[PDB]
Design a protein around this nucleic acid. Structure first.
Ligand SMILES: [Zn+2]
Ligand SMILES: [Zn+2]
Lengths: 31, 71, 91, 87, 176, 112, 36, 77
RNA sequence: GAUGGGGAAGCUCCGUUUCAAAGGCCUGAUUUUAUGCAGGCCACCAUCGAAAGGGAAUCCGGUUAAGAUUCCGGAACCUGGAUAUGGAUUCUUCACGGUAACGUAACUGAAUGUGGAGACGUCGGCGCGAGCCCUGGGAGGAGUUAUCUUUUCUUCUUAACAGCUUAUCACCCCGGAAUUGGUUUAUCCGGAGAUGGGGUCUUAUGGCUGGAAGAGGCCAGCACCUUUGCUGGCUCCGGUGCGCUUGUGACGGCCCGUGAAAAUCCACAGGAAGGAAUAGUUUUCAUGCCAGGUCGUACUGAUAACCGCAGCAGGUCUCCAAGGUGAACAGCCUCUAGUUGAUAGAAUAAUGUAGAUAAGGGAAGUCGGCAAAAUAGAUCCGUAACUUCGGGAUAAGGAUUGGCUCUAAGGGUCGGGUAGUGAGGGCCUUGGUCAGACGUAGACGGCCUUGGUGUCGCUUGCUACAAUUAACGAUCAACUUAGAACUGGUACGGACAAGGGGAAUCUGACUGUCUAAUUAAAACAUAGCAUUGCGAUGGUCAGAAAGUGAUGUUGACGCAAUGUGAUUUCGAUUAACGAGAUUCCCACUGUCCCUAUCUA
RNA sequence: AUGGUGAACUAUGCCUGAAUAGGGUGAAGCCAGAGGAAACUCUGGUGGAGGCUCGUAGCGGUUCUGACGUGCAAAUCGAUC
């Protein structure tokens, strides 16, 4: 956010949701 | 000045240019047998000194003014 | 990335004073406005207060040094030679 | 009226210590004691000794400043000086 | 206040007196920074301040030793006879009792060449390059005056020259 | 929209002639001259603002009580308690060094 | 480093205490003198 | 001007030697958007300070008014 | 700028702490010599110089023909002094509490030493507060009403001072950190102890209360020759922000520039001493008593109050600063306040001055495009040679701009549960016992609930998906951006406001500088560049000479004098810039062919 | 020639105070991202430097077939820079 990745609050929220999904999938695949 | 005498219990005097408030209060007390509450002073543009002398409630400036003889 | 190709910190001087003079000013300016390490507490918290006076933000120590850099090479060599010859005085 | 100093009036001015009195009279201590006995000058005690002596608690002898001032006029003092010259 | 060494006395002649650096401050019109050093007065129970010229490496809170038998460390002042061959000093006294005359500008120092048998004399190389012989009792601060490299930066501006030279006595701008 | 004037005879925006604007019980705006802001007293060693000490202009300290101007400790109104702790530790270790060094000196001059 | 060394000479010295010879006596606190 | 809370302190203060005049002031106010109630302020004039005691209970205010000293001169409103 | 000294024929000169006996303080029965002062302690030189620097302390309301932080009324504060009572303290004499930061109503103190405050540059953004601005409800008054407008305007305020409370920063305690974490708009911070939880502190500042509604404001009803007063009402509750002015905090930037002093006040270290038991202490706690001199104070502060010989279209320091348009302290219009001053009247020829328009042509005019015209805001696209790579640049050159109806985007605050046990807070619907003074009435209140607004619930302890859909909902508010339809134009930066641009040559590097009133540069200065001298028994100067003055608070990275003046490249060359000089180009035009008309 | 008087204007040093819209441009440092074995290069931000710049108040003056000559002005106003 300091680096200007996110255009607004909705963009940050959706990116968080996607990143949590990616973390979940990565942990499940390493399981 | 006479409005002050009647309303505010204040006697207005022309005093000596060399006299300070202590001397004014003492002189008024000695000369007129009255108690003095406060003395305010100014120097008039004509070179003289004017004193507003406020007496205590025990004394009536109007009565003292009549006794002096100006009314 | 790089807002300026070559001019660097000397970009405040615009096109004035000449290329060579701007280049000469550049190195000393970079030294001067830099943040140096503290020899006393080991933190990069030392900045110049005035030419020759360098203060640490933490541990609040003021030291004497060079005009535009905390230490000069002459001072470093003088320090080392003092150490060496006082050691030989002891020995 | 500007601010007055804080050790000049009251007890500080009312009382004078023995050494200050002797110095002010410009006589010796023996002469001072003789004069005080001749004239009935006796030591006094301030109620506020710290205020009389600049906050000091040390035991001091105090006299009335007006009594010392009166003592300064005694002709017996002039007689003492005449005796010193004669000696 | 003028930048002078400590007044000579028995302590500095024989032993050492220890002072402490309180602040390193900027003097108007002088390139080198000044150091305020507080000593204990040997006779009277009171602290006395001194204004030395700061050498490179001197820092606040540092112990500065002054005397014949003080450690050969930067900041310490010593009689020139107490230092060995080849040392480097600053604020060198020309002769005993003048309180410092040589190598006072920033980045300048005086090297020791060698001593003398016949009396207490020492010879030194001055910043210009002259070779001079002074009394070996003359004192000096170990190290090099702080603030070196100052003349290497171009001023670039009449305004910077104006601000520099209004504090000095040099007439600026120059005429004739 | 009501405009105000300085109330003292100094007509200049000096450091000691600063005003504020206040509404009065008469419903009018008026200038109110404000005194200079007080500075916190500083520690005698480090220079940090010592805590528990009132912040007043220098003359005003003559009016408040002692408790406003000190804390309950050695050097209470002058040093900041970290400086006091370091002072205590330094004094104790100086005394200890004196003891050890004197013993060493006596033994050395015995064996020398 | 040299600043720390400058302090060490004046304040308490473990090396000098060790050099004094008596160690457990000092740990028990056997030597005491009063100055000033 | 100082507000005093303790009734005992208020009575001792009203018996103080420098005190000559007091004043009883009546206010009409509202309690929590409630009915218009009475507020009695007792203001005792000291040499340095005017001391104000605020009572929100009319009966207590009346009984305190009875409890006041006789020599004290009271000005009502 | 005296004194002490020293000069000078002298009027007087030098110097500002010295080559001065430059003055204060403590103790004493100094044990014998009998009526003569003994023993000690400490060091520094006047004075003047600021109504913009430093600095003890006052506010509100009212009052005059003219006074006002000065008078009147009320409410405060400061300083100095004398002192008493309460409180505190003390038989552990000079207080206890807290691990600590530290707390408090107090809680003795001479010499001597030390520290703090006074006390400090400039710029930038960020946060906060105050006044103002804008705005909603309600209670009043006024205006409009041809038609419309739950409407337009206006009042709804709260001083110094006092008590309680209120904070960034900072600090303390617990604990030990890598998958490093915390964190500002701005990247800084942590084993020299981060994150986290709990604390302590300064009181800028805000809030509640006292002051104080009794004041002030806005209304209604009352008399009556009057030099006159009276009676009732209301004076409440919110919101917002890149707003304006201002103050302030924590920060960042700049310096070969680092940005007063003194009076004055406080504290610390120390401990000469003094101080209590059928009695002491503490005036740094509260209260009480007394006092505050001298001089200024009116009015203007300028096209009518000063200076220019005036009652001059000139000049002269500073504070406060409403609404719209708009980037805006611009220009234009308006509110509060102020003014309507300038010799008037009647006519309207030419000429003059100021301001405009113009067919066709378009520099043909003139020494010379002089002057006018044309350009001009903002958004999007687009931009050459040259260049010291920073610029050139708003280069040049295109498109667009109104009104209206929409679409999309950009935020804040609060929200976690019942499946489940049982207690806790408050007017407890109704119902129960004790139980409150005054003027048939009688509240409030000192005590309790398993209930109520499978036994709802406002609270902790906890099992149970606590949320990997809070991926959502309730509630609150500001103005910005982007786009798409429709629609009128002879015009959309519609008035105001507001660059003409380009191609070559000469000149100076630049920013800067002097000719007050006919000469602003090619000259002066400038950073840079080189040379030369000087190590104190010295250099440069002032001086005829000196117990010669300064530089000098000086020491070769210094001092000073010279000559050249950016920089680069090859004496030439050079980007950027210019109220500098010269030749042209586009555009433009009443300069002209060639005049004509309108306004003041 | 002798002896005096002026820095209220103006010139300059020093001390203590005061004043200076709104825009353009976008330096160092910092955050995120991409290509290069490295050096380094590139993109998007953030930040807010400069004896930079447009342009008020201010300061000064290249000027004008402008008003003007016993003018309102013994030096003015307007315009302009
Ligand atoms: Zn450090
Ligand atoms: Zn400290």
């Amino acid at each position: 956010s300091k680096g200007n990745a996110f255009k607004h609050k909705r963009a940050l929220v959706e990116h968080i949701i996607q990143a949590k999904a990616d973390a979940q999938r990565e942990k499940a695949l390493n399981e | 000045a006479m409005k002050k005498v009647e309303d505010g219990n204040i006697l207005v005097f022309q005093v000596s240019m060399k006299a300070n408030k202590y001397q004014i209060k003492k002189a008024v007390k000695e000369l007129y047998e009255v108690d003095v509450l406060k003395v305010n002073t100014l120097v008039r543009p004509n070179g003289t000194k004017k004193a507003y002398v406020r007496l205590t409630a025990d004394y009536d400036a109007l009565d003292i003014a009549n006794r002096i003889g100006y009314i | 990335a790089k807002r300026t190709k070559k001019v660097g910190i000397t970009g405040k001087y615009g096109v004035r004073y000449g290329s060579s003079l701007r280049r000469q000013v550049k190195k000393l300016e970079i030294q001067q406005h830099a943040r140096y390490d503290c020899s006393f507490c080991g933190k990069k918290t030392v900045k110049r207060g005035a030419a020759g006076i360098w203060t640490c933000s933490c541990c609040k120590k003021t030291v004497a040094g060079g005009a535009y850099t905390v230490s000069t090479a002459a001072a470093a060599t003088v320090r080392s030679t003092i150490r060496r010859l006082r050691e030989m005085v002891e020995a | 009226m500007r601010i007055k100093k804080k050790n000049t009036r009251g007890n500080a001015r009312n009382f004078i210590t023995r050494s200050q009195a002797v110095r002010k009279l410009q006589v010796s201590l023996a002469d001072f004691r003789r004069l005080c006995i001749f004239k009935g000058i006796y030591p006094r005690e301030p109620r506020n000794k710290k205020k009389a002596n600049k906050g000091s608690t040390a035991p001091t002898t105090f006299y009335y400043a007006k009594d010392i001032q009166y003592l300064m006029h005694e002709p017996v003092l002039a007689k003492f000086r005449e005796h010193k010259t004669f000696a | 206040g003028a930048a002078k060494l400590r007044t000579l006395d028995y302590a500095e002649r024989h032993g050492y007196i220890r002072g402490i650096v309180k602040q390193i401050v900027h003097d108007s019109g002088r390139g080198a920074p000044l150091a305020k050093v507080v000593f204990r007065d040997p006779y009277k129970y009171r602290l006395r301040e001194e204004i030395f010229i700061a050498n490179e490496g001197v820092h606040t809170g540092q112990f500065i030793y002054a005397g014949k038998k003080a450690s050969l460390n930067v900041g310490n002042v010593l009689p020139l006879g107490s230092v060995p061959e080849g040392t480097i000093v600053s604020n060198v006294e020309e002769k005993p009792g003048d309180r410092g005359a040589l190598a006072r500008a920033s980045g300048n120092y005086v090297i020791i060449i060698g001593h003398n048998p016949d009396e207490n004399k020492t010879r030194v190389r001055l910043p210009s390059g002259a070779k001079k012989v002074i009394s070996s009792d003359a004192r000096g601060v170990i190290g090099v005056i702080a603030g070196g490299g100052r003349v290497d930066k171009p001023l670039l501006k009449a305004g910077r020259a104006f601000h520099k030279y209004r504090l000095k006595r040099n007439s600026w701008p120059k005429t004739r | 929209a009501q405009r105000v004037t300085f109330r003292r005879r100094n007509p200049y925006n000096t450091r000691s002639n600063k005003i504020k604007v206040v509404k009065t019980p008469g419903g009018i705006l008026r200038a109110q001259h404000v005194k200079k802001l007080a500075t916190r007293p500083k520690c005698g060693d480090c220079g940090s603002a010592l805590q528990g000490i009132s912040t007043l202009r220098p003359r005003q300290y003559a009016t408040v009580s002692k408790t406003h101007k000190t804390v309950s400790r050695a050097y209470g109104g002058s040093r900041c308690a970290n400086c006091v702790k370091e002072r205590i530790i330094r004094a104790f270790l100086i005394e200890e060094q004196k003891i050890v060094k004197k013993v060493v000196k006596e033994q050395t001059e015995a064996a020398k | 480093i040299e600043a720390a060394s400058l302090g060490k000479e004046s304040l308490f010295n473990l090396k000098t205490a060790e050099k004094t010879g008596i160690l457990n006596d000092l740990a028990k606190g056997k030597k005491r003198m009063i100055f000033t | 001007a100082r507000e005093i809370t303790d009734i005992k302190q208020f009575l001792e203060l009203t018996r103080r030697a420098d005190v000559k005049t007091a004043t009883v002031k009546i206010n009409k106010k509202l309690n929590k958007a409630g009915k218009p109630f009475r507020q009695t302020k007792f203001k005792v004039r000291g040499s340095s300070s005017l001391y104000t005691l605020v009572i929100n209970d009319a009966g207590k205010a009346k009984k305190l008014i009875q409890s006041l000293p006789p020599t004290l001169k009271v000005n009502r409103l």
